[PDB]
Nucleic acid binder design. Structure first.
Ligand SMILES: Nc1nc2c(ncn2[C@H]2C[C@H](O)[C@@H](COP(=O)(O)NP(=O)(O)OP(=O)(O)O)O2)c(=O)[nH]1
Ligand SMILES: [Mn+2]
Ligand SMILES: [Mn+2]
Ligand code: NA
Ligand code: NA
Length: 327
DNA sequence: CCGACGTCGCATCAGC
DNA sequence: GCTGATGCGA
DNA sequence: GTCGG
């Protein structure tokens, strides 16, 4: 519905979620809060009491309490106090740097490193990923208009075909779902000489080429099948530089192409829903295969997949275009 | 009461 | 030197 | 923190 129906409640739960993940390092409380925030966000009525909220799956006793305090006072004592806490709030903030998780963040704050300015003063203490996360902190939190996404796609598809015309490159993620803007670019890569059964540097060659034409600018991580890095559109004339963008490139077995594209097209919430209904119907799905579950619930051999629809067919669900996979 | 809470690739750390 | 464990992001 | 064995 509309995000101001219970926006105060869901903002509260989301904030609680972050402090559980980043500060308390309690990942399951983090997910519990977000699960509750999500079900309340869909609730098409303005919540009048914690008890009313408790009817929803994922909303229990403790969250019911907190909603009652929020409704009555417009705030949470615990949340106000945690905000005022220098240590906790510093740890929470530092995890916004890509590469800095709850563990590294706590470690930094322990030795007095609390801000971005503290981080820049201490490059020695940052690993490769974290330095780049720091370097492009502002850029990485910017969103990408679809127009720039299309220019980025133009370059990717072009340079990929130049290396080898038998490559297949597919931009997935929110882009494939037709989103008007994206958080990054996700690229799936496929080549005839790489299948599940069976050239040594297939992913490397593409990365190398995208670097040569100055599209890819930084490397966060790179292995045989997964590239995580930074890219940037070229500027014209003197007209000022574009923001640096996050880009992932994945090389998948050609015979497992459709499971891969389904998986990395998402959305995340769509995938977990599809996986739940897959278990409901006695199947299991990952980024590679769909496999039947025997009577005792053990996965069998990968099924033949020749399209995305085939995966939908197996679990008795009406085919849905990428644009309808919001959830 | 108390165990489950997706899974995966890469970077880095712990320890032989 | 290596294997196994853990952090991290998606 | 929530759910359910
Ligand atoms: N295994 C796994 N896959 C995920 C997860 N989250 C997302 N994905 C799988 C499915 C995600 O949809 C997807 C591609 O990753 P993104 O770029 O991170 N997400 P998207 O492109 O939809 O949003 P954005 O516009 O902000 O970039 O990969 C996750 O938590 N776990
Ligand atoms: Mn994406
Ligand atoms: Mn991504
Ligand atoms: Na409930
Ligand atoms: Na981070």
């Amino acid at each position: 519905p509309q995000e101001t129906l219970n926006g105060g409640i869901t903002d509260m739960l989301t904030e609680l979620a972050n402090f559980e993940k980043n500060v308390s390092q309690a990942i399951h409380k983090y997910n519990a809060y977000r699960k509750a925030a999500s079900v309340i966000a869909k609730y098409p009525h303005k919540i009048k009491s914690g008890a009313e909220a408790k009817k929803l799956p994922g909303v229990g006793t403790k969250i019911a309490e907190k909603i009652d305090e929020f409704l009555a006072t417009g705030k949470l004592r615990k949340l106000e106090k945690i905000r005022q806490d220098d240590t906790s709030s510093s740890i929470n903030f530092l995890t916004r740097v890509s590469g800095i998780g709850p563990s590294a963040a706590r470690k930094f704050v322990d030795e007095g490193i609390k801000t971005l300015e503290d981080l820049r003063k201490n490059e020695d203490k940052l690993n490769h990923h974290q330095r780049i996360g720091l370097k492009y902190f502002g850029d990485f939190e910017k969103r990408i208009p679809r127009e720039e996404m299309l220019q980025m796609q133009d370059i990717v598809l072009n340079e990929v075909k130049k290396v080898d015309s038998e490559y297949i490159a597919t931009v997935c993620g929110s882009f494939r779902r037709g989103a008007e803007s994206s958080g990054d670019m996700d690229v799936l890569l496929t080549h005839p000489s790489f299948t599940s059964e069976s050239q040594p540097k297939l992913l490397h060659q593409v990365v190398e080429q995208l670097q040569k034409v100055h599209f890819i600018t930084d490397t966060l991580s790179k292995g045989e099948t997964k590239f995580m890095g930074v890219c940037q559109l070229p500027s014209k004339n003197d007209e000022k530089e574009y923001p640096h963008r996050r880009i992932d490139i994945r090389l998948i077995p050609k015979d497992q192409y459709y499971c891969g594209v389904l998986y990395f097209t998402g959305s995340d919430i769509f995938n977990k829903n599809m996986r739940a209904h897959a278990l409901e119907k006695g199947f299991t799905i990952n980024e590679y295969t769909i496999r039947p579950l025997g009577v005792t619930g053990v996965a069998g051999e990968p099924l033949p997949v020749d399209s995305e629809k085939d995966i939908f067919d197996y679990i008795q669900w009406k085919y849905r275009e990428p644009k309808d996979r919001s959830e």
